[PDB]
Each structure stands twice: as structure tokens, then as C-alpha cells.
Amino acid sequence: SVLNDILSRLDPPEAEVQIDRLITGRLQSLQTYVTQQLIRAAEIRASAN
Amino acid sequence: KLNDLCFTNVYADSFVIRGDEVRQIAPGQTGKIADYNYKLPDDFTGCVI
Numbered sequence: 001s002v003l004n005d006i007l008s009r010l011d012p013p014e015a016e017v018q019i020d021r022l023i024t025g026r027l028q029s030l031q032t033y034v035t036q037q038l039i040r041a042a043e044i045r046a047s048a049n
Numbered sequence: 050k051l052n053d054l055c056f057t058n059v060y061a062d063s064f065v066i067r068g069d070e071v072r073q074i075a076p077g078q079t080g081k082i083a084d085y086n087y088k089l090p091d092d093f094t095g096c097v098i
Contacts, residue, residue, distance in 0.1 A: 013077030013091050 051096075062087075062097075 006018055066074065066082060073080025074097065076089045083089075 011077075 060095075 001022075003022065006022065007015070010018060012019075064087070070080055070082055072078065073083040074087065074089065075083075076091055076093050078089075
């Protein structure tokens, strides 16, 4: 689960398969969080207004 | 599909190694000669005969 840990253990050449995925998975976390924030922000905006 | 595709900057590599080490001369592989004499790049897009 750690980028520093995974990188030290693995070389770039075959590194990518695990390095690539963690990145894909983490991107997902951000998008969910980013999307979630917007919905929450919209709710707050209506409340603010 | 080689003929249909068109390319620039073609290079030719010449050398003789034993049959056992033929596997070593490939992208992302390890051998005495591969890591000490001639190492193929990770992004190589070439064909070896």
C-alpha cells in the first residue's frame, strides 16, 4: 500500500504493472472524494442561499 | 504488418552471443552481458533476429 515501499522493492521495467494500478485505484479515491465534495458543496450553497 | 507501417531513424545492431544468453537480450531482462555489455531500453520498439 506504500509508494515508497513498492518502488524500492520493484524495478521500473516490471514496476509499472503494480505502479500503474495503485495509481489507477488512488485516482478513484480522489474522484469519489472530489465528486462527493461538489454534491456536498451544492447542498451547502443552497443552504447558504 | 511491418510493410504497411512506415518509420524513420532505423538502426541495426551486430554481435554474436551463445544460445543460452539469447533470452537475456530483450527489454526488461537480466544477464551478465545484458547488464554489462548491451542493454535494451524499456520503451524499445524494435525486432531482434
